[PDB]
User: Fold Methyltransferase Plu4890 from Photorhabdus laumondii subsp. laumondii TTO1.
Amino acid sequence: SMLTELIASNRRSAAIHAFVDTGLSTHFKDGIYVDISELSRKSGVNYARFSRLCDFLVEMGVLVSNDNKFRLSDECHVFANPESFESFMIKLEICSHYSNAWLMYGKSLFEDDGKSAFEMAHGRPFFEYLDGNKFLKSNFDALMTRVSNLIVEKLLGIYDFNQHNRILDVGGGEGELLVRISEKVKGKHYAVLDRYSELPVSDNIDFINGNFLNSIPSGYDLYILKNVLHNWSDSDSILILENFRKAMDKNSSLLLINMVKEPEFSRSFDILMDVLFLGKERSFTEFEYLANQAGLVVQETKVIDQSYSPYSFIKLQIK
Amino acid sequence: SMLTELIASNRRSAAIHAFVDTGLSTHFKDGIYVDISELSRKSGVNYARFSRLCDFLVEMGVLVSNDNKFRLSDECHVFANPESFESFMIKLEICSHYSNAWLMYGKSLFEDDGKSAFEMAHGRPFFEYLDGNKFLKSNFDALMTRVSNLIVEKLLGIYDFNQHNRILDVGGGEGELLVRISEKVKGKHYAVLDRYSELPVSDNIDFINGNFLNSIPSGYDLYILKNVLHNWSDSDSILILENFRKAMDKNSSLLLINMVKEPEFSRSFDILMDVLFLGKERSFTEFEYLANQAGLVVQETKVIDQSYSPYSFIKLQIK
Ligand SMILES: C[S@@+](CC[C@H](N)C(=O)[O-])C[C@H]1O[C@@H](n2cnc3c(N)ncnc32)[C@H](O)[C@@H]1O
Ligand SMILES: C[S@@+](CC[C@H](N)C(=O)[O-])C[C@H]1O[C@@H](n2cnc3c(N)ncnc32)[C@H](O)[C@@H]1O
Ligand SMILES: N[C@@H](Cc1c[nH]c2ccccc12)C(=O)O
Ligand SMILES: N[C@@H](Cc1c[nH]c2ccccc12)C(=O)O
Assistant:
């Protein structure tokens, strides 16, 4: 049935997870065909029961069946690499923490005390909780690192980075975006601001233990705020963009990079942001209103298309 | 993307759950259009955040948008009734117990000690665990009751129940199948065998605390075994069908009713049975092999089509 298989959408995600989180997917490297009997003999996985999983994976378009054997489909080759963006996504998407956060979502919709479904389940807000959970931080930081590495080429092409001298990435995670830009744009001072208990070390990168709710450091002519604002309310978004204006002179520029609400794409991400952060996706026109209210003006607007989502590149300067 | 939204299949199930498990869905009774503002004022649910859920529900085909208002779609009217089969399915499908069972699935595929993913997560096999968990038993028993009520009309039509006098439903749950057949087929002795700590009471129904692994009671000319065999291994399936042969004379008949492996339908159910029970779905030809090995013969075979799954009606008699 249409409705019964919709109610059983969860089974698709769980099947994928069982395949990759075990590391069975890593046996399907370079698009080669795997004999399940030989894999069972090699890995010690149960032939009969794993064969039934492989049949369900073929139905979902993840595996391709031929000569009583299975290979990963062309689009799903990424699952063969455990450090692929898709591999991290599935390990994070379906974990006890996310599931338990989703299970409070219903109850969260009736509370007005600004407590996220995640916080109701786990006792602290997302980032605060990740400070005490290694599994959850590494996989989150690793995921954001991978999506960062993927977008670099498309940024460097559309915008002139050569013009600036002092660049700060605000909430830049492990700093991967700048470390990639530092390789293709040379002889410039690079700084990454994020919440650190222990500073990341790197060759000529300036890692700052900071708080963008309190203040942004002045003395940079380029600022970047990538995939941050969707983790925050409209009010706290204006607070961060205000803290930018206070730190910037008329020469200085801010690159607001973020996933954007395109009507033709799915709202599933918008709901996850509500569950994890009490966040939300926003249209370009909504991002501008927050900037205008904070006293920043839009100089240049570019839409970037990525595998998983469309992005909004917005060049901001003080009014 | 095709792969990223596949990895995020879980979000569809969770969104549905948040809508129904809260009982918000019950405000969409008789296909009427709901004003989210009025619902927020009435129920106390957050307008902004619930409106974003309603937009995602429209995308999934659960809600229909008109005049800045939402009604349940025709196929999803069932969600308005909290005692509908679909409402119970979603409450059971996505719960901590099922999610935690799914999270052991990967690790379960490497163990050979006959421990289900559910058992690895929860410490006992499914039915054994339900003895100590009210939430999980009621919702399970209620779900099986509803699917029982739905199939009655189609059974009574295809098979002559009027010919028999003493009928036993083996593993009949709350007994709902026979209680419905007792209303349309009259003046016959009705017995229901299942695992009971406290016997269900009912007007002229004979509830037996039994164990179909040990033995079936003799002295019945009709036996029914509906939706049981998919919760068990091939070996334990033969044991149950053997226990039938031992209890039956040449006059006696067994109705093996069960969901069947049709190649054109999804394998998601087959994987859930592996996770919950170390069970599996089987083709008619596979069900016959288990019966033939147990020393039973097929007299009459009927395929029944139901909303959620195709069924296999198999009339068995001793060889
Ligand atoms: C959605 S992630 C984006 C990371 C990075 N832009 C990327 O895409 O690789 C948001 C980041 O903001 C950081 N963050 C959260 N609260 C912060 C705060 N108050 N001050 C500074 N950084 C914060 C988190 O640690 C996280 O690395
Ligand atoms: C999948 S449910 C089917 C219930 C019922 N046929 C229906 O569809 O409404 C299987 C039933 O078998 C029962 N059961 C499990 N193990 C049993 C055993 N050893 N002896 C008897 N009944 C058992 C369970 O309690 C459960 O009610
Ligand atoms: N990164 C995934 C979704 C996701 C999972 N966990 C997250 C945490 C933060 C932001 C996004 C996510 C996507 O692109 O769809
Ligand atoms: N009854 C649901 C699936 C389901 C959920 N929990 C179960 C327990 C036992 C058997 C089936 C189920 C269906 O028809 O798809």
Summary: Residues 2-84 of chain B form a domain with the Arc Repressor Mutant, subunit A fold (CATH 1.10.10.10).
